Amino acid sequence: XXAXXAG
Amino acid sequence: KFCRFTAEGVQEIDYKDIATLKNYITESGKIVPSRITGTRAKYQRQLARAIKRARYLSLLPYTDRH
Amino acid sequence: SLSTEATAKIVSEFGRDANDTGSTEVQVALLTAQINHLQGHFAEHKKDHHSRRGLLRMVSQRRKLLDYLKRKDVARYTQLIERLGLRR
Amino acid sequence: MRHYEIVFMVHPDQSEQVPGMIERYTAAITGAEGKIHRLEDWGRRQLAYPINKLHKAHYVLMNVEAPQEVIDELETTFRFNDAVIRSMVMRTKHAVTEASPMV
Amino acid sequence: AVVKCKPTSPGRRHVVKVVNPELHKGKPFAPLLEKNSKSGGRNNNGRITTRHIGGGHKQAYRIVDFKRNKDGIPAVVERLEYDPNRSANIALVLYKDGERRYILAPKGLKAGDQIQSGVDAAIKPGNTLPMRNIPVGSTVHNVEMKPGKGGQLARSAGTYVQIVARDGAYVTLRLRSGEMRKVEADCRATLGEVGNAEHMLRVLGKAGAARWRGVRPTVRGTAMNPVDHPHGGGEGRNFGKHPVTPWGVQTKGKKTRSNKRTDKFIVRRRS
Amino acid sequence: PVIKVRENEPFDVALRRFKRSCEKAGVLAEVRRREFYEKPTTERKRAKASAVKRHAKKLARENARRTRLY
Amino acid sequence: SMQDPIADMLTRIRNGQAANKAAVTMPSSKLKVAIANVLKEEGFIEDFKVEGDTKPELELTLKYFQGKAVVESIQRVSRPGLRIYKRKDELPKVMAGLGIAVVSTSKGVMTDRAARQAGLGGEIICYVA
RNA sequence: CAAGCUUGAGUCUCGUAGAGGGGGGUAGAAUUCCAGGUGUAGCGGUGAAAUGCGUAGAGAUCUGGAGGAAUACCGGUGGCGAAGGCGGCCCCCUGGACGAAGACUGACGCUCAGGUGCGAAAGCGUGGGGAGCAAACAGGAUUAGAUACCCUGGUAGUCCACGCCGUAAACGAUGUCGACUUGGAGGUUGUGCCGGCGUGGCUUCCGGAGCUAACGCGUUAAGUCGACCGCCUGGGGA
RNA sequence: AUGUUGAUAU
Ligand SMILES: [K+]
Ligand SMILES: [Mg+2]
Ligand SMILES: [Mg+2]
Ligand SMILES: [Mg+2]
Ligand SMILES: [Mg+2]
Ligand SMILES: [Mg+2]
Ligand SMILES: [Mg+2]
Ligand SMILES: [Mg+2]
Ligand SMILES: [Mg+2]
Ligand SMILES: [Mg+2]
Ligand SMILES: [Mg+2]
Ligand SMILES: [Mg+2]
Ligand SMILES: [Mg+2]
Ligand SMILES: [Mg+2]
Ligand SMILES: [Mg+2]
Ligand SMILES: [Mg+2]
Ligand SMILES: [Mg+2]
Hints:
Chain F: Residues 42-70 are annotated as: Disordered. This is part of a larger assembly, with 7 protein chains of 7 kinds. With 103 residues, chain D is of the alpha+beta class. Chain D has 2 helices and 5 strands, in the order E-H-E-E-E-H-E. In chain D, a hairpin with a 2-residue loop joins strand 3 (40-51) and strand 4 (54-66). Chain F has 70 residues and is an all-alpha fold. Chain G has helices at residues 5-18, 30-41, 112-118; strands at 23-27, 45-47, 50-51, 57-62, 74-76, 85-86, 100-105, 108-111, 122-128. In chain G, a hairpin with a 2-residue loop joins strand 7 (100-105) and strand 8. Chain G is globular, with a radius of gyration of 14 Å. The relative contact order of chain G is 0.19. Classes of the chains: A little secondary structure (7), B mainly alpha (66), C mainly alpha (88), D alpha+beta (103), E mainly beta (271), F mainly alpha (70), G alpha+beta (129). Chains in contact: B-D, B-F. Chains B and D meet through helix 2 and helix 4 of B and strand 3, strand 4 and strand 5 of D. The site of one magnesium ion (MG) has 3 residues of chain E, from loops. The structure holds 2 RNA strands.
């Protein structure tokens, strides 16, 4: 998830 | 090592011959490996059968603790 | 297996000689003796499947020797199956 | 007729029957066109472990040449005889007259 | 021989017969036959005291020899017979003095076999000895409870008792129930199982087959009105009671053995 | 294993002789073996693997004896 | 079972050549000997000889030239599973005529050269090159 | 088509090794349970715990008893079997393999679609049995969660009889039969000649030519050939 | 003991 990454 | 049964030219190991059979068991009563005693495979099989027959007739013990 | 005596009796009965062990009649007769003997064994030992593979080899071998004998000599075949008491 | 090596060992209380049992068992063999090739009363030995809460028993060897039916009868005799605490009947390839390592 | 019937009608579809071709096809031995007319489960007050008994086939009683007291004298099995009065088959035996008797047929017994009773008898199926003379571990049937009384235990098709131990005057038995039970060692027993062990594999297949055996219908308690049975009553299928007999005793678990007289002879209850 | 402590023997020596006897009979190894069930396939695989180790040792052991390292 | 003794002879030669064997010995037969002649006459093998009466044994002596074996290839063509017969016009030239096809014609076993000359076709036994 | 022949195939004689198979019996070690003695506060379990067991006396220790299941050591890249598989000891019935001497039959052979049989484990049916183990299940943990791994229990099942199922990474991922083609070191089982020198069978490891995409295979071929069968034709969908 | 994950194209 997170509504779509790596930071 | 070396095999005593080939040397003597024996036919059967014989379950009755306890004096012989006692040389091929441990203090615990266990059958000794052929790799230790240097017995030929053919005689090792006969020897196992002999020991197992002797253990049944209670001429040898199964174990050190009965 | 068939005993030395019982074997020899069949060799004499079916052979042209006492030493004629090879003949198709002797071979077929010997197989028939052992096939018939084993019927008692397999009646008792229905799940002796390993032994039965040996029985079915005898049955097969006998079929091959009879099919040989038949085309080689029809009369010798007809005599043999009569004596041994085979359908074919 | 097949060759059998028969060991049986007896309750040490019934040691005095062992002569009688031997002659009875040999009669069963020899009264069927049988033979006794060897017969060795080993006597009372120390058991390697306790059988039947006993520390000794009276052993008897006898090699034999009997039919199967009497040896089967002999086994049932050993079975239903509270004297005979243990028995072993082995087939041998040939007759054995040579004396055992026990004697 | 267990044989499934073919479904040529709905009443036959589920029938499984146990067909023994060894059994005598003829009539039974008349000197050992008696009338036993039926009860309907009614006692001498004329009242039903056991429910669900009535009708079924007329049956003559065969005098079976449970005592087996004719000791010493050998007997040969003439023929096995069907007995209507019991689950086991019976064997008409002929004693060498020319007396005939019926016995319970052990497993493996056939016409021509020799049997004998007594202290000195051989340990083979069919032979009857005092249990002191029988080896510990033996499988036996038709076991006496008191010496001379006659066999009472292990009489049904396929049943037997193991002699598990012998301690002085008493032998311990493992009964079919699983109960371990002391009995006097002077009590006789016959060697081997009772025959006809296929008996339990039969499937009656229809209502009428139970009626032939003289069993009348069981009506469920819950089918009745409250006046008739504790379970009676309800608008619809109702219950809401602990299950009980028609006389109000709990019928799922509650023990009913009460016999301090015989408690001593029970080593272990069946449990 | 069953040691009689003989007359005029230190305990420490007799204890060492007991350890010997147990290691000889292979009691601890037997116990550890039987602690859990080994599937026959697992038993067979380890027997195979042990044999292959001892063999692949023996052949490659001789190779090390021949060749110089320096 | 053994079901092509010719293929077996060719294979004994092929293998024997590869193994730098001096001679190769098979069980004999008329047809094997007939082929051995054609291989001798065309100079692929050196010599052969049959020996025995009840069980005759053919024995081909193999050739090597400048180290190398002389029989470069030797292929069964007609075989029990598939028989090849050719008419005179359709006889095979092995290695553009530098090698032979051994042909069983009505007038005996011979090369495809000899069969062309004799105006015969027949069963194509093998190629040799 | 006819007649042969003995070299393929088979029969006979004597012997050899074998957890080959079927049936029956029996032995010892251990677990569990039951009963009793001694004894007293823990036991058990784990990474750490807890559930669990225990003063109603457990655990430990000793004696006696019951019952089931499996056979330590021997035991071995040992053996046997068509494959699946087969392991205490004894007997009964029984199959195959191998070797040595001949004698015998005379191509009787190889392969095999369809067919038939056998076929681990799990599973199913009927009836038994049930110690130990253990799907399911329950509880205790762990964790964000933990329908898991770990722990305490535990039912089917695992065992027996008979019947069914017909599948497995049922594997050497390598069809069967036959021939041919440098070596080395073993294992196992016969045998001949006199510890050595041969000669058969089966088998483990290495490796040469050759082969192979390579890895590797390598006289037990994946080399060189023949016979017959089975099977493959992009991945998925399947 | 346990101990997850890393948007699309390039
Ligand atoms: K997520
Ligand atoms: Mg044979
Ligand atoms: Mg009723
Ligand atoms: Mg009812
Ligand atoms: Mg109503
Ligand atoms: Mg009421
Ligand atoms: Mg309602
Ligand atoms: Mg309600
Ligand atoms: Mg097919
Ligand atoms: Mg299963
Ligand atoms: Mg089941
Ligand atoms: Mg069941
Ligand atoms: Mg668990
Ligand atoms: Mg498949
Ligand atoms: Mg495969
Ligand atoms: Mg290699
Ligand atoms: Mg990640």
